[PDB]
Amino acid sequence: ARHVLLQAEFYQRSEGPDKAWAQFGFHFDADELFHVELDAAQTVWRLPEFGRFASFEAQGALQNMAVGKQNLEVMISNSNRSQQDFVTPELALFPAEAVSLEEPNVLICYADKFWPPVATMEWRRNGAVVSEGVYDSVYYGRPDLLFRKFSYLPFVPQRGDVYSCAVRHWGAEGPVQRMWEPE
């Protein structure tokens, strides 16, 4: 359409090993307004300004999640435990802003076209893991029913530094990785 506001939720689980996950979010065109922390009943706005403009009663999402959990078990039963092939992610790595020496920037790792939406990013600078200040998004849908996810690393560009983002997808035989260096 011309603009779309979308409430997107899911509940999923693995066996061997047994684990479950769920998600509830509001989205406007390609971007995320908020998601709910489903263990904490917390509305988490993607940008702080949004929480100064609007509110959302978080427990509604958790009540929806209980419905989705029941629907999952019913559809697993109705389908005779029907399942589908995993799709591994493709990765893009690019700075958020024009690169200047000694000017704070943010490196963006975008994992796309994967299923199911279970995937973690790990950042390295010159081969050493970096964690402080990293932000990871929740999983954003796609019309082809695959998913995508952003991770962000604050950094200060310096000549000869090499960054890497590695994505570990549920069930994958290994991580997929991409590297980037400031020009």
Binding site: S14, R52, S55, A96
Partner: protein
């Protein structure tokens, strides 16, 4: 602060009697021609298939796969459910639009424009970042004339933080005057950046 409403609550499926299983539900408000028209959709997903959907222009659930058919028939049997769902397009969808409009529909973030010689120099790069909405026009002019032949643009890329970026490179061996012109809704006049 006003409170957003749910766009929907998932309907309950009917039971008809290593591994991985996934169930998703999506509730969409489509805002067409500004406030003129709303189209409301529900979509129910199992693993990687949409089973059943609702389109307010139709007014009934429609199955997209045989697994969705018992579900559409079940829900379509409930007249009051269909009435309530049919009310969402001009109800919660428009309530949420009224709250959100000023900072989504009307969000405006200026692009940041850098022009950069690349290599000697065989390419000029016009890097445009940080803008919202994603619609933008970035063009190269040499000596006054727009260059279409030797221009390579990335797609407009989503940064995921409600900003977008694009890089537009002119393959050229330095005419005398190059300009990158950027037109964007956030700006009262276009940005013209000339290369030194």
């Amino acid at each position: 602060i006003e409170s957003l409403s749910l766009n929907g609550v998932p309907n309950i499926f009917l039971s008809t009697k290593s591994a991985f299983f996934f169930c998703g539900a999506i509730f969409e408000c489509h805002y067409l021609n500004g406030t003129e028209r709303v189209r409301y959709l529900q979509r129910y997903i199992y693993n990687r298939q949409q089973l059943v959907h609702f389109d307010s222009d139709v007014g009934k659930f429609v199955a997209d796969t045989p697994l969705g058919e018992p579900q559409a028939e079940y829900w379509n049997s409930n007249a009051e459910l269909l009435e309530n769902i049919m009310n969402i397009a001009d109800g919660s969808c428009r309530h949420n639009y009224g709250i959100l409009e000023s900072f989504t529909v009307q969000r405006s973030v200026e692009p940041k424009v850098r022009v950069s010689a690349l290599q000697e120099t065989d390419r000029l790069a016009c890097y445009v970042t940080g803008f919202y909405p994603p619609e933008i026009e970035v063009k190269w002019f040499l000596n006054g004339r727009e260059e279409t032949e030797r221009v390579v643009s990335t797609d407009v890329m989503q940064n995921g933080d409600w900003t977008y970026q694009v890089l537009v490179v002119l393959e050229t061996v330095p005419g005398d005057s190059y300009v990158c012109r950027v037109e964007h809704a956030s700006l009262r006049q276009p940005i013209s950046q000339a290369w030194e």
